[PDB]
Amino acid sequence: NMKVSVYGAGNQNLYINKLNLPEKFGGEPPYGGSRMAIEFAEAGHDVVLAEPNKNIMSDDLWKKVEDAGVKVVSDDVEAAKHGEIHVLFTPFGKATFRIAKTIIEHVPENAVICNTCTVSPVVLYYSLEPILRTKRKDVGISSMHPAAVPGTPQHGHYVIGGKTTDGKELATEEQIKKAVELAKSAGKEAYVVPADVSSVVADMGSLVTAVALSGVLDYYTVGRKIINAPKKMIEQQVIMTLQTMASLVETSGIEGMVKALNPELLIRSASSMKLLDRQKDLDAALEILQNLDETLKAEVEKAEIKPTTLVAAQSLVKEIKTLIGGAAAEGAIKRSARKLFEHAD
Amino acid sequence: NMKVSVYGAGNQNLYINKLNLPEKFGGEPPYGGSRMAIEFAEAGHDVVLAEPNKNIMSDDLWKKVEDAGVKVVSDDVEAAKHGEIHVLFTPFGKATFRIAKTIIEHVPENAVICNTCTVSPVVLYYSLEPILRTKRKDVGISSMHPAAVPGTPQHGHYVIGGKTTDGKELATEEQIKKAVELAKSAGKEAYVVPADVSSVVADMGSLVTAVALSGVLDYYTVGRKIINAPKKMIEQQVIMTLQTMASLVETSGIEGMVKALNPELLIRSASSMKLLDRQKDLDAALEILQNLDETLKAEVEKAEIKPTTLVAAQSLVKEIKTLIGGAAAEGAIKRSARKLFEHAD
Structure with missing residues (x-):
């Protein structure tokens, strides 16, 4: 009890x-x-x-x-x-x-x-x-x-x-x-x-987690079983795409990140990645991107891509600790973790 | 010519x-x-x-x-x-x-x-x-x-x-x-x-981009049309999930990030997000996560979750510029952009 x-x-x-x-x-x-x-x-x-x-x-x-x-x-x-x-x-x-x-x-x-x-x-x-x-x-x-x-x-x-x-x-x-x-x-x-x-x-947000994870695992399979890309290369591509998407939303919002990524282009590129014989995630995605709301497309058109400095965040955490360190590094880190996690404001 | x-x-x-x-x-x-x-x-x-x-x-x-x-x-x-x-x-x-x-x-x-x-x-x-x-x-x-x-x-x-x-x-x-x-x-x-x-x-890697983007847009629709979450809240959730996934792969690899996220759990949570009447991306994802390779599951089991300091990267870029700045900030940034973009090594 x-x-x-x-x-x-x-x-x-x-x-x-x-x-x-x-x-x-x-x-x-x-x-x-x-x-x-x-x-x-x-x-x-x-x-x-x-x-x-x-x-x-x-x-x-x-x-x-x-x-x-x-x-x-x-x-x-x-x-x-x-x-x-x-x-x-x-x-x-x-x-x-x-x-x-x-x-x-x-x-x-x-x-x-x-x-x-x-x-x-x-x-x-x-x-x-x-x-x-x-x-x-x-x-x-x-x-x-x-x-x-x-x-x-x-x-x-x-x-x-x-x-x-x-x-x-x-x-x-x-x-x-x-x-x-x-x-x-x-x-x-x-x-x-x-x-x-x-x-x-x-x-x-676990909706995004689960969808993104399914794309990662799909890509991991193509990369291991079809392309024969080394493990570290698959990971570097995984980090590069997700970190870029996160940071584009962080500076520019969903509309601005979509303006930077270009879904039209994404359909073309990702088409070349249909390499296993059933990729339901890819198929869903290509479909979704083909049928963007007309008024979403209109926001995207007019969106600003704000200044974004694209970096591997854990590597940058490592840099701030070894370059400045102590209490000023901890302050920068707590503020940036807070910017990440804080639900409302 | x-x-x-x-x-x-x-x-x-x-x-x-x-x-x-x-x-x-x-x-x-x-x-x-x-x-x-x-x-x-x-x-x-x-x-x-x-x-x-x-x-x-x-x-x-x-x-x-x-x-x-x-x-x-x-x-x-x-x-x-x-x-x-x-x-x-x-x-x-x-x-x-x-x-x-x-x-x-x-x-x-x-x-x-x-x-x-x-x-x-x-x-x-x-x-x-x-x-x-x-x-x-x-x-x-x-x-x-x-x-x-x-x-x-x-x-x-x-x-x-x-x-x-x-x-x-x-x-x-x-x-x-x-x-x-x-x-x-x-x-x-x-x-x-x-x-x-x-x-x-x-x-x-554009496979991951396109799948992840489709999950973001799905989540954006549920959030706007069904939950009525403010725009900034939807963006904060988008940033939080993708940035976490990127940084977990950066320190721990695909196996370690999967150990941290728990696909079993993800199936349960993301189930509550079936709110529109066709979400092919979510359906694909739940399916994929349900059918993880048995030997992938075995790597995941034994994976180490390495030290990870979860931060909003653009906010941390802002911190390093205003705290240290100049040539040492530029050096840290170029190294961290290089860690992000470099294809082979």
Whole structure:
């Protein structure tokens, strides 16, 4: 049994009407934060749900939350005192950071604080870092990311943030094991993933990840089995294309990156790469690029390709450490990681 | 009419046997460099072809080259003196750079030197830069990249490198206009593309570009039409996923990046993104990820996720300029652009 505090019930009007989820995906309301609370309560845990606004959910939905055994409070500090694990199902932007900052002072010894989809745990860690580093060295940052809308049938799993690909531990092993056991007790598959990459595998952007990965693996097969390109050459091409596309969107936006890449041209080039006898990814892609929206094509036409300095980012991280280093290098790196991960502003 | 010099006939055994092109794509031999020479000669241009090794092509294929009106020399310096435009259909690695360095001394005033698929024009420019900057300020670097194997039916176009996304001009407008007119006279579509990105749209890696772009545009549609996510949020997710994937391959290789991303997990997450009623790219991707080669899965299992510091590269370029700047910043940037673009080593 665990003490669990969940923050934010979920905008039910959004799930129900705007996304039309009960019709499009399945399950029944409530969805989101309250649904996670329900599930944790049903797992036999001691669950508190903090929600300042009782209007975001029908009274009948409230009843289902309480019926599950969840204690509903409107005071974040009260949930802060309760939980050994704290799950922020809280709005995009300032609100998440305000709540985290509010509870950090009050959570009990060794509590772990977890993001869901509205924030990166790396950025949440940066926002609490002055506190975590002085007054609350015991508190962990992790994630309890559903990577699905809780209450829909797609929700069979949780993404939990562990040690970053840089080796930084944001939470202890104990803390991470608690989060894992929480996900499992609710009948979900638990995935521990490096905390920096959790967003990449769990947010709505995971559509891009999965499509891009499929193109990489397709290219890897052609390169190994048909062209016989050395491993390092295939990797260099992989890095060159994805890094260029990322950096073009970073300076110029989706429209500007499309202006630079030219989909018309891309159809021609990528045609020469039909070398295996079924490449469903390539076929899909060529089709999609052939049928660009006429008004998208019109934005693209008029887009500016802003100044872009195309570089291998890890090599540039290496350069800044050995050339300037110390506190100024760390400052540059934290700002640039923040530019990468920060969800809203 | 133009004087044109092409370097490298093309390994005919490779196109014919190893890639089985006449059977798989069409056309007739010769393919490659000699084929470009043939086509330029047929366009009514004064064409020289430099090839040190007469064994790389059957005597009957040689005959077709000469029959077209191409003058065949085995001396690079002799082709160097001839051409106003110089097309390097030359091997991966040292050989391309050795030839470029050999001809640079001898090409006539205002000549333009062009890469094809074995080299990036940015890296070719770096290798000649001490010369281009002192003795040969008149010489241009561009590309004449077929983005297809010349002699196959897929070859209907040329990618020509113009001003870089950073604003650097590697060749004059005159020089670029010559290259364009060359491509057109051969009946090809001419695409002028920023020279830094030419590789990304023209090399074998353009498979990854086209697949990844299709996932980006799919995600852009869901985000605009279904989720109603603000434009900047969609872009931030786009940057975050592609930049992470690039940098994971950069430190850890394809196997290590797949170990970090977890395709099993990716199937689950990306499932929640089936929101439009036909997403052929997503469907292809989920399929591909479900059916990973058993021995690929085994490499992935044992792969190391090396230290990776996940950052937005353009933001980090901005940091190095304002923190250190000058000659040390330029050195760091050139090395990191070189790490990105360099095809072989």
